[PDB]
Request: fold
Amino acid sequence: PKVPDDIYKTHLENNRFGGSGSQVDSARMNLASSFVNGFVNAAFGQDKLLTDDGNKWLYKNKDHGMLSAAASLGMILLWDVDGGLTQIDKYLYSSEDYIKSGALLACGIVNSG
Amino acid sequence: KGVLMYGPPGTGKTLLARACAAQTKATFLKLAGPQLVQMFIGDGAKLVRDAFALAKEKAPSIIFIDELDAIGTKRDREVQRTMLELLNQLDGFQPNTQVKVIAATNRVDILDPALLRSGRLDRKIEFPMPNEEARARIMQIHSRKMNVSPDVNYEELARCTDDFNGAQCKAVCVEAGMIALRRGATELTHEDYMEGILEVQAKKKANLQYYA
Amino acid sequence: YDRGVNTFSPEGRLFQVEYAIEAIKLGSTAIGIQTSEGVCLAVEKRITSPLMEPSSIEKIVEIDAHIGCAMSGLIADAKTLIDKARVETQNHWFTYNETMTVESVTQAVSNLALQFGEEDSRPFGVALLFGGVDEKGPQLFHMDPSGTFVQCDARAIGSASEGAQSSLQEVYHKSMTLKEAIKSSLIILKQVMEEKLNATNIELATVQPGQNFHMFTKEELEEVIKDI
Amino acid sequence: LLTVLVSFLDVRNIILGKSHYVLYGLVAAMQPRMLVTFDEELRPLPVSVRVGQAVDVVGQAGKPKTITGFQTHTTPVLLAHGERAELATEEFLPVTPILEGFVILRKNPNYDL
Amino acid sequence: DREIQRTLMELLNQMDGFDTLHRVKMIMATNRPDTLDPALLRP
Amino acid sequence: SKLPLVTPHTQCRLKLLKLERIKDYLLMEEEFIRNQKQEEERSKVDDLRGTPMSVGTLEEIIDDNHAIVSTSVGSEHYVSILSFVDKDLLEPGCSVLLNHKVHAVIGVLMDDTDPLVTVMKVEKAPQETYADIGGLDNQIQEIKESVELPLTHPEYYEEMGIKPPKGVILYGPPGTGKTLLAKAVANQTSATFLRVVGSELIQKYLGDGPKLVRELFRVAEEHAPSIVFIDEIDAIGTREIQRTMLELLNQLDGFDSRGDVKVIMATNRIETLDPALIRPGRIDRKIEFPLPDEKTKKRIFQIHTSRMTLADDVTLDDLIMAKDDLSGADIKAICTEAGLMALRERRMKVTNEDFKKSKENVLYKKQEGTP
Amino acid sequence: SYDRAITVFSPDGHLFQVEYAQEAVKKGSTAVGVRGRDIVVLGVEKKSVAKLQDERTVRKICALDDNVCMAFAGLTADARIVINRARVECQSHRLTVEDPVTVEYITRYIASLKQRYTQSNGRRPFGISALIVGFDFDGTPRLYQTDPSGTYHAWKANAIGRGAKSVREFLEKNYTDEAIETDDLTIKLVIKALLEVVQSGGKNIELAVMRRDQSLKILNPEEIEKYVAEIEKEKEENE
Amino acid sequence: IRALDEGDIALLKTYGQSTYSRQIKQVEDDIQQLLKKINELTGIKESDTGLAPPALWDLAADKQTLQSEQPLQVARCTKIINADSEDPKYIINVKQFAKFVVDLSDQVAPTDIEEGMRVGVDRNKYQIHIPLPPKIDPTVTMMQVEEKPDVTYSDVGGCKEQIEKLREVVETPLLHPERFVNLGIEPPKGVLLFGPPGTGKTLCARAVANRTDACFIRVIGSELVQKYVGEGARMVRELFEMARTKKACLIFFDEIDAIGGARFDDGAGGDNEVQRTMLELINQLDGFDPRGNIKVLMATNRPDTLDPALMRPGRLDRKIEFSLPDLEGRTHIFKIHARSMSVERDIRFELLARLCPNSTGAEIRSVCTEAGMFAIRARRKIATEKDFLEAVNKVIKSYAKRYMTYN
Amino acid sequence: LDKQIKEIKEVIELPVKHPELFEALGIAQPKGVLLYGPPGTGKTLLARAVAHHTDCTFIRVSGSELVQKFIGEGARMVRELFVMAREHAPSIIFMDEIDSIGSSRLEGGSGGDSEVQRTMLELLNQLDGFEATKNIKVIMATNRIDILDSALLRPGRIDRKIEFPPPNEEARLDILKIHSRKMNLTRGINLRKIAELMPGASG
Ligand SMILES: Nc1ncnc2c1ncn2[C@@H]1O[C@H](COP(=O)(O)OP(=O)(O)OP(=O)(O)O)[C@@H](O)[C@H]1O
Ligand SMILES: Nc1ncnc2c1ncn2[C@@H]1O[C@H](COP(=O)(O)OP(=O)(O)O)[C@@H](O)[C@H]1O
Ligand SMILES: Nc1ncnc2c1ncn2[C@@H]1O[C@H](COP(=O)(O)OP(=O)(O)O)[C@@H](O)[C@H]1O
Ligand SMILES: Nc1ncnc2c1ncn2[C@@H]1O[C@H](COP(=O)(O)OP(=O)(O)O)[C@@H](O)[C@H]1O
Ligand SMILES: [Mg+2]
Ligand SMILES: [Mg+2]
Reply:
C-alpha cells in the first residue's frame, strides 16, 4: 500500500514549507492525505498508515474529516465484506462520534458493487 | 627590423619574447596571428595598419607577433589581404623609423615565400631542441623554488630526458612536485624526478611486429 | 602509399600488410598451448548452419603424424600454406629420413610467405599456429603473413584475440599437466568467445612425443561435456 | 459520477465546505479494468493474448476486429481506455467473443495438430 | 570575396577611361603574377 | 483542433449518420456563437504600453528591472523593465516589445524567428497510424519499448530505476516502411515530430551542418516531449562531414542532460555505417525491416486495396505467392497501377487480371541487366 | 586505401573484389542441390524459353565425368570455361591416376583453380558458384559447394543464387534429420523447393538424379510434373 | 485505347456511384464551409504577451519610473582625453549611429570609468551615467553550464588512478591551495583525457562539473566552428576573458579532435580556418600574458590527431588514459549501474563481468538497460539474473552482428 | 506527337483535372513522368503545352543547373525548388536533362564527385516521400535514355515513361506547316517534297 506522502514524494522535492512551519497536523492536508490513502490504496484490502495507526491518525484529524477519513478505509477494503466488516467494528463502537459517522458509511461502501 | 624566432613547440620562444618585453622597458605590442583575421572584408588590413601607426606614435615601440602561420600561410582571401598589409607596412615605402617586430611560429615551412624575405625578417633565430646541459639548466631554473633535495642528479635527469622540450622539463619538475605531495614529503627527491619523467614521457607506442 | 608493399611510408611502415594483420583479425580465433605433456590446439568453427558438415571446414588440420596446425584468417590461403607444409614434410622425410623439426616447417611456410614482392602477388592473409613434437622437444609456434614466426607457449590468434590471450596468459604456467591446460582453454573459450562447448563448432587436436596416431580429438567429447 | 459532478457546481460549500463525503459517490462507479481468463471450471488460466488499440482498417461497414500496435502479454493484463485484447493463438475458443473483464476459455476441438 | 571582384571591375573600367591626353601612369607590383586575372593581362 | 475520423469508408449510411452527427455539432457551435470588466487592468498596463509598441531583441539583463535591448536600426539601449513582464520568459535573443517613446521593456513576444527549423517542425504526422501498417509486429514492439513506452509511461522505467534507451536505428531495404513506422509512432504518441532528410544537413557552409543539428536539438528540447527523425542517415552516416558526425554523436551521448527527446535514424546501408555513430551506449536498439513475407504481403495488399472498389474474381493469393521479391512500396505501386489499368479499359471496379498484369509489369520494371 | 583492385586489402583487411564476385553470384538464378539416403537430385529453374529460343542449347545442367554433373551459376561464360577445365581435369585424372576420379579431388581442383585465378593482378576471378554431386564417396552420395573465393565445402543440402537466403532457410525448415527413405521423397522435396522458382511456375524445371552407382539420370517435364502433383497432394492435406 | 472523353469520365463518375454520393459529398462541403464560418465567427486567436499574474505587478511606481528615468543608449567608451584631469572628456561610439565627445554625470566618478568599458549614456545630451558590464557574446555566455549534472565520482567505476590524477589538477588546487603554496609548487593547469569511445570520459567531465564548485564551462567542437573567418577565434577570446572574470574557472572541451587537427598546408590551404581557431586557442592557453587561474580539460577519441603544440605540456600538462575496463572495473561499474534498479539481491555480477568481452562502460550501461527492458517487457518488478544473461547475449551478439572470408 | 500527347495528357491532366476518380478508385495519383528521345524532339515544348492547358504553373530547373560547385547546395536547391512548387500549389516541375545528374558516377581514382549522387538521392527522397502531392507533378527529360539509371525509375517512384522518336513524314509535314504558318510563302511551294528530302529530321 502506497503512502500519500510518498505519492506527493515530499522526500525528494525541495520542501520550501518545512522546519518550523510544518510542525502541525492541520485539518485540510490531513483530509487530503486520508482521501489519497483511500483512493490509491483502494480495494487492496490493506494499508500501512491507517491500519497500524488507525486510531492515532484519526485522533489528529478534526470535524468533517472524521466522517471522511474513517469512511476512507471502506475504499481500501472494497468487496472484502468480511474484511472491512471485521475492521470497522473497532470504530463501530468508537468513543468519537464523527468517526463513528464515517465508519457507519464505510460499512456500506464496502458492500458497494 | 625583422626577427622571425622559431622552433619546435616546447622551447623558450614565447618565454624569450616575454622576457624581451620585460627587460627592454619599451612600449610593447603583444598579439597573436588570429587576432588580425576578423570577419569583415577590409578590417584586417585596418588593424594591421593601425597597430603599425600606434607603434609609430609610441616611437620606442616593439611589435610581437605570435603564431605567424595563422596568417602567414603561403598562397580564404581576407587572411591573404591581412598578411599582405603586414608585409607592406613592414618592408615597403619608408618603413623602420623606430619600430622593431618579433615573429614566432612552429611551422616555418608553411610561410615560405611571402614574409620570410631577408628584407622583412632580417634575423631568423632557430630555437633548437634543448641540449643536455640546456635541459639540466631548464629543470634547475624551474625547480629553484621547489625546495628540492640537496642531492638531485640533474645530469642523469637530463640524460633520461632526451627529446624532452623545455616545457616538458618544466612539466617534469611540476610532476615531481605533485608526486612529492602524493608521498607527503616536505621536499622532493630524485625518485620523484624519475617518476615525473615517466609521467611526462610519451607512450613509446607499442612493439611493432613489422620489423621485430 | 596504398598501391602495394613496394611503397614506403614516411615512418617506414608498408601500408599494405598492416591490412594483412587486420585480415588476421577478421578471421575466427585459434588457441594453442605448449605443455611438457603435450602441445594442444583449440579452434572455433563459426558454423553457419547445421546442414554444413562441421568437419568440412578445415580450420584444424594434420600437417604430419607428429605435427598439427590451426590458423586464423583467409581459409584458401591457409589451405595453400598447409599443403606446402605437408609436401615439405613429405619431401624432407623421404630424402633425409630425419623428422622435420616443427621450427623448420615454420621456416619453410614463412619462406613461401615471402613471395609477394620479393621475386620477379599479395601477402597471404592468414596467421598460423603449429603444434608438434620431435626428438628434441615438443613445441608450439606462431607465424603471420609478414613471414616472421615465434615460439610461443600459449598463443591466441584471430577475432577477439586480446581477451582470450589475456585469459590464456593468466591461466598459463610452465608446470601444467595437459589435462588442466586443456580444461582451462575450454572454459576460457566457453566464457569469452561463443557459448558452451559442443562438437559442432569447436575442435581440439593434441600432440604427444610418443603418439603418432589419433592426432585429433573426435567422437569422445562426451566425457568433457558432462564433466566440464 | 453524476452526483459528485453536479455537487461540485458549488465546490466552496459542498466539497471544500461541509460535505467531503460526497466524493465517495464515485465508489458506486468503482470497477477495475483487466482481463482474467478462466477455464470452464472457472479456475484462473494464464493465456497469451494480443493487446492494443482498436481500428477498422480494411473493415468498411464490416469486421472491425483490429488490435493495432499490439503487444503479446500473458493474462492477466490491465486494459486502459481504448485497449482491446484478442486470443494470440486459436488453440482456445472464448465463451464470448468480447474479451473484456472476466472471460472463460475452452480447448478448441476443431483445431487439430 | 564578392567586393574584390566588384572593385576589380571598377578598376578595369576606370583605367580603361584613360584618355590619350592624360599624363597619368600605372605601376602594379606583385610577387605571384600567376594569380592575377588575365583580364588585366590583356592588351 | 481537427475533425473526428469517420471510419466507414465504403459508401454506407453509417458514414452518413456520422457525418450528420458532426454537422449537428458544428451547427450548435454556430448557433451558440451567434447568440451573443477589466478596464482597470487595461487602463493601467495597455495604456502604459502606449501604442504603437516597437519590436526589438533582448541582449542582457543587468538588474531586476533593467536590461539591454537592441532594435532593428541596430542601436543599443539600457532600458527599464516594467513589473508585469515575466522575467523567466526573458533571455538573450528573445524578441521584446518596447514602448515607442522611452524604449522601456513592456513584454515578451512569442518567437517567430529561426524559420527553417520552424518549418521542419512539421507536426503534421496525422496522415497515418499503427493501423496503416500491417505485419511489422516485432518492429512495432521494439520501437514501442524503446521510444513510445518511455514517452507514454516513463513510470515503469523510473520505478525500475532505469534510464530509458536513448537512440534507435531502423534499417532494411527501401520501401519496407521505416519512414511509415516513424510517422506512425509520431502519430500514436502526440509528442512533437521532427523530420530532417539526411543529405539536407550536409551544407556548403562550414558551420551550417553542426549548427543546423545543434539548433534542431535545441528546438526539439524546447518542445520537450519530441521525436526527431533522420532518414537516410547514410548520407552523413557512412573532416567537415565527420565534424557534423561528431556534433551529432556528442549531442546524443555528450555533456548536459538531454531529457525527453527521442531519436529515430533510418538507413538503407546499415553495414556501411561508421562504428562511432552506432554507439552501444546510445544506440542500443537496431530494428531490421525485412522484405515482407507471405502474411505481411497479404496484410499490405488488404490495407492498400481496401479503399479500392474490387470485383469478385480477384484471387489475392496468386498475387501474394511466389517469394519475398518485393516490399510494401512496390505493393502500393501494384495497387495504383492496377487502378490506372482498370481505369483505361473503363473499370471503376478493378479485377484480378488487372493486378496480374500490374505485378508482371512492375516485376519487369523491377531491376534490370543483360542476361 | 579503398579496394580499386584485386590484390590490395582495405584498412580493416577485407578484400572487396571477392565480395563483389559473391554479389555477382547472388545476381544469378536459383540452384538447390541435396543428397539423399542413396541418390543425389538437382533441379534448376527459370528456364524462360523465349518462344523463338529453344531451351536445350543453353545446357543449364552439364555432366563432366563418367559420373558427375552440375553447371555453375553466375555468368555462364565462366561456367563454360570451368566446364572445359573440369572435363580436362577429370579425363586426365582418370587416365593418369592408378584409380578413377573422386568428388573430393575434383572439388579441390575447382577450388584451387578459382584461387589461383584470383591470386594475381590483371586476372578477373571466376564469379560463379557451383554445387557438385558425386557418386564415388566410397560408394556413397555426398554434396559439395564451390565459392568464387576459391573455397569448397561439403553440405548435406545447399542452395545458391537468387533464392540462396530463402531456400536455405526452407532447407533448415524441413531437411529431415531422418535420412530420406524412398529417395523419391527427397526428389519430391527438391520439387517443392523448385516450386519457389524465380517464376514459381514449376512447368520448366530441369531435374537430374544419380543414385551414387548409376550414371547421369535426367527427369522429363512430365515425370517431374508427376512428383509436383504428389507434392501438391501432400500440400492439400491441410484440410 | 482511346483517351477518356468528357462523357466517359462523366459516366465513370456517375454510373459507379452508390445512391448516397450526392448527399455525402454535399454534406462534406457543408463540413468545410461551416468550419470556415466558425473560424471567421470566433475570430483569430489572441497571441498575447507577457503580463505576469495580475496581483504580482504594476503599482504606480511603474509609470512613475517610466516618466522619471531615462532610456539610456549604450556606447563604447574610448580615449579619455584627460587634457587637464579636472574635466577629462571622453569619446563614445554609438554603434551604427555616431561618435561623440562627452563628459561624466554628477553621479558617476572618473575612477568609475575606464577606456572601452561599454558605458551607457543619455539620449539627448549624451552625458555618461552608468557603469555597464562588457559585451559578452550570447553564444559564448550560454556555454556556462549553470546547472550541475547528477553524477558524482562514486558513479565512475574502475578508473581510480584516472580520477585521482584528474582531481589532483582540476579539483585539489581549488579546494586546497595551501598544500601547493606552502610546499611552494605550481600545480598543472591542463589535463587531456583520451581513450576509446564510451569509456566514461564525458562521464568524468560531468562528475568534475558536479564537484567543481567553481565556474564550469563546457565546450563542444560545433560551438567553436563558425562559418565566418576569425569568428571562432573571437568566441574563444571572449570565452577566455569570461573565464578570467571568474575567480578561477574550469574549461572543458569535449572531443577537441573537432578543432585540434594538426596543421597541414599542401592541401590547397586545407581547412585553415579551423586551424586558425585552434591557433588562437593554442595562444590563449599559453602565449603572451599569463593564462590566470584557468584550469582546462580536454577529452578526445583521437589523441594522436591533435596538433603537437596542443599536446605540449604547459598547456596540456597531464594526459590520462581511459582504457577498456578490467575485470575488477567491470564488476565495479556493474555494481554502480545496478544500484539504481530493482533487482535480485543475489545477482552474481562478477560472473556477468567475466562473460563480458573487452566491453566499454557504455556497453555495461547498455546491457544493464537491456536487462531493464527484459524485466519490463516481462512486466516483472524485479530484474533477474536470467534477464541479465539475455541482455548480455543481446548486446554482445548485436555488436558482433557472405562472411566466408573467415576461417 | 499525337500518340505521345495523348499518353501524357492522360498521365498528367487526368489526375489534376479529374482527381475524383482517383479518390473514387482510392489509388493515389501518379507522381511524375520521364521523357526520353533525341534532342530537339519537342519534349520541352510538349511539357510546356501540358502545363499551359492544365492551367497549372510551370517551373523549370535543368539537371545541369543542379550540379553547382559546392556540396550541400544541390540538396538545398532541390528542396527549395519543391518549396516553390508547393507554394505555387497547382504546378508542374521540369528537370530538363536530368541525365546530367542521372549518369554514371566516378568509381574511384584521383578524385570523385559524390555530390551528383547526393543531389540525386535528395530529389529521390523528395518525390519518393510524395511531399504534399496535392495538384503537384514533376516531369523530366533525358537525351538517350540508355545513359540514365533506374534509381528514379523504381516502382513507387516516377511512374510513366514516354518516347520521343524522330518525326516521321507526317510529323515533318505538321512541323513544317506549323512553323511556316507565319512565313510568307509563294505559290509553287511544295512542302511535301522538302519533308521527303529530309529523312531522320530531329523536329
Ligand atoms: N630554455 C628554457 N628555459 C626555461 N623555460 C623554458 C625553456 N624552454 C621552454 N621553457 C618553458 O616552456 C614553457 C612554454 O614556453 P613557450 O611558450 O615559450 O614555448 P614555445 O616553444 O614557444 O611553445 P608554443 O610554440 O607551443 O607556444 C614555459 O613555461 C617555459 O618555462
Ligand atoms: N508494412 C507496410 N505497411 C503499409 N505500407 C507500407 C509498408 N511497407 C511499406 N509501405 C509503403 O511504402 C512507403 C514507405 O516506404 P519506407 O520504407 O518508409 O521508405 P524509406 O525506405 O525511405 O523509409 C509508404 O508509402 C507505404 O505505403
Ligand atoms: N567507468 C565507468 N563507470 C561508470 N559508468 C561508465 C563508465 N564508463 C562508461 N560509463 C557509462 O557509459 C557512458 C560513457 O560515455 P563517455 O565515454 O563519457 O562518452 P565519450 O566517450 O564521448 O566521453 C556514460 O554515460 C556512463 O554512464
Ligand atoms: N513536333 C514538333 N512540333 C512543333 N515544333 C517542334 C516539334 N519538335 C520540335 N519542335 C521545335 O523544336 C524545339 C525543340 O526544343 P525542345 O522542346 O527544348 O527540344 P528537347 O525537348 O529535345 O530539348 C521547340 O522550340 C519546338 O518549337
Ligand atoms: Mg608560443
Ligand atoms: Mg527540350
